Amino acid sequence: KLNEDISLIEKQTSGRIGVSVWDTQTDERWDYRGDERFPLMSTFKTLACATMLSDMDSGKLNKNATARIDERNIVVWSPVMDKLAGQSTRIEHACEAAMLMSDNTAANLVLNEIGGPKAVTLFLRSIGDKATRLDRLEPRLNEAKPGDKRDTTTPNAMVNTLHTLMEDNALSYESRTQLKIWMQDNKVSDSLMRSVLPKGWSIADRSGAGNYGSRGISAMIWKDNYKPVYISIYVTDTDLSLQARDQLIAQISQLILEHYKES
């Protein structure tokens, strides 16, 4: 039993763990604290990029829209954008950097072009997510203060929203294909679910880390002959180091994925 295992793991950490799974092959859903709030951290980047793509689909934002990177605007962890001061970059390229490398300046550029955190929240409400909310830019959104509702989601809401983005009509076919490729090409989450993913499985994911010992991941996994499984794993309010948080996400991923060894 997964519930008992996660409650024991949670007791060791002295924090809160939230998990949600929706298997679209079996139509089975399961969660642990699935409707509780956890910080988004960098897992918001998928949602900012989906908002941007939906604006491109609707004719409200040019596919080739650009914006200028100014040195004074570059924030922490911007491995791609920190080479571009003085240059114009496509907003689409900023989303590629946010999704592949978790580039924070790139994510802020996308947020500034689409109407900010308020616009991402409005997009989420328009596609049926009543829980998730984005309120601040990077890096302030990593605060993850217990009880603070700013920049939060729930494990169930991320699973439901990712399924809406990938399988419903929130995005055009071109846009959902692009978002999926960016999530498959994620380069910064190898120590998490990817480290324990069984052979034959494909993965599209996005992770995050925050203050108060927070870590999280939103993923979609599938096989040639296995319909997508949507998973959320969030941890908060711990004293764990980043390395121990990575190990904990891989540990929870292993417990979920062991069910799929013969799937």
Side-chain angles (χ1 to χ4, degrees), residues 33 78 81 85 94 105-106 112 114 116 137 148 156 226 234 246 263:
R33 297 194 195 283
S78 303
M81 298 292 118
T105 297
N112 291 333
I114 66 181
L137 304 175
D148 190 350
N156 282 344
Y226 202 95
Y234 286 83
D246 293 352
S263 301

Side-chain angles (χ1 to χ4, degrees), residues 159-179:
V159 154
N160 292 338
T161 294
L162 187 54
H163 173 268
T164 293
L165 295 172
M166 298 292 177
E167 291 195 89
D168 294 336
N169 265 335
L171 295 178
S172 65
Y173 177 77
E174 172 192 51
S175 285
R176 62 187 94 103
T177 297
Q178 182 61 264
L179 187 63

Side-chain angles (χ1 to χ4, degrees), residues 57-262:
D57 293 344
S58 72
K60 269 96 144 192
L61 185 61
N62 297 330
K63 186 57 157 180
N64 80 165
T66 60
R68 192 185 68 251
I69 306 109
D70 296 328
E71 187 68 59
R72 74 190 301 271
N73 293 335
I74 301 167
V75 298
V76 65
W77 193 259
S78 303
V80 182
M81 298 292 118
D82 68 2
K83 289 182 174 286
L84 315 173
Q87 293 177 48
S88 178
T89 194
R90 283 175 70 245
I91 316 303
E92 177 106 349
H93 183 65
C95 258
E96 181 195 82
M99 301 298 293
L100 272 60
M101 292 299 296
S102 207
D103 188 306
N104 283 331
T105 297
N108 283 349
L109 184 147
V110 173
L111 289 176
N112 291 333
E113 288 298 305
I114 66 181
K118 285 178 181 188
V120 176
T121 303
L122 220 48
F123 170 72
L124 291 166
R125 297 289 178 277
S126 80
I127 68 170
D129 184 337
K130 297 181 175 177
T132 308
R133 47 182 287 185
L134 187 63
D135 297 88
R136 290 172 294 180
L137 304 175
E138 281 285 1
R140 258 262 111 169
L141 61 85
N142 295 313
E143 184 183 17
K145 187 176 186 289
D148 190 350
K149 296 188 287 183
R150 291 180 294 184
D151 314 301
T152 60
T153 186
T154 74
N156 282 344
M158 288 300 273
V159 154
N160 292 338
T161 294
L162 187 54
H163 173 268
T164 293
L165 295 172
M166 298 292 177
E167 291 195 89
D168 294 336
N169 265 335
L171 295 178
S172 65
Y173 177 77
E174 172 192 51
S175 285
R176 62 187 94 103
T177 297
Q178 182 61 264
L179 187 63
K180 177 178 155 181
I181 290 165
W182 282 333
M183 294 184 79
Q184 284 187 92
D185 292 347
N186 183 7
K187 299 170 93 294
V188 298
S189 306
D190 291 354
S191 301
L192 310 179
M193 187 172 286
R194 286 163 184 262
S195 76
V196 298
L197 188 65
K199 194 73 91 175
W201 291 81
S202 290
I203 182 160
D205 61 359
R206 172 95 305 279
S207 54
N211 187 24
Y212 293 89
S214 305
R215 197 76 167 110
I217 189 167
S218 174
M220 174 180 65
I221 63 165
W222 70 98
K223 306 177 93 191
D224 297 314
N225 205 20
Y226 202 95
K227 286 165 187 170
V229 180
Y230 297 86
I231 306 168
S232 282
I233 308 167
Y234 286 83
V235 181
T236 195
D237 203 16
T238 76
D239 294 327
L240 301 174
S241 65
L242 181 64
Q243 172 166 292
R245 279 177 261 161
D246 293 352
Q247 297 165 2
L248 177 55
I249 298 298
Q251 181 186 345
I252 299 161
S253 295
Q254 171 74 28
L255 291 174
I256 297 165
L257 293 164
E258 198 69 346
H259 174 84
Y260 292 96
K261 65 181 191 166
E262 286 286 339

